Homo-oligomer: A and B are copies of this chain.
Amino acid sequence: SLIWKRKITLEALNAMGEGNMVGFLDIRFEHIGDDTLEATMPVDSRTKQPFGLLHGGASVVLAESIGSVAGYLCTEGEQKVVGLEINANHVRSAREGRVRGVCKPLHLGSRHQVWQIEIFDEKGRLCCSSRLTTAILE
């Protein structure tokens, strides 16, 4: 199923993060299915807490970053999306490597959207499950 309303390439996406938070974290997308969007992120002196574990906020940064663009790719023309509510359950820690976020839609309405982003570690072990609720602004 194709949910995307706009067309884009990993090239353009990754370009977005340069100059802002997304950039200074090395978050790079790596897939764009018909109804799915993936991305990864490291685990170092930028995405870790004072104990050397994948910071929970880092996972949310990753979740929101992907959900935001994905929601955008589901709109038309001058439309835009703004994240309203986000939540996440940290069910497993991470200390090294890169985590991959898999974003899928739970609901794509005309005025708002709900995105689910599951984050897994290199071994494929689920570390975080988050949801993003956005509003479509004309």
A→B interface (CB under 8 Å):
16-17, 19-24, 45-50, 52, 55-58, 60-65, 68, 82-92, 106-107, 109, 111-112, 114, 116, 126, 129, 131, 133, 135, 137
Known contacts A61-B57, A61-B58; A133 and B20 CB within 8 A of each other: no
Nearest chain B residue, comparing its CB with the CB of A107: B91
Main secondary structure of the interface of A (DSSP, over half): mixed
Q: Answer whether A133 and B85 are a contact pair too, CB < 8 Å, given A21-B57, A24-B45, A50-B22.
A: yes
Q: Which residue of B lies closest to A133 (CB)?
A: B85
Question: Smallest CB–CB gap between A66 and chain B, Å?
Answer: 10
Q: A89-B114, A129-B106 are in contact. Are A20 and B50 (CB under 8 A)?
A: yes
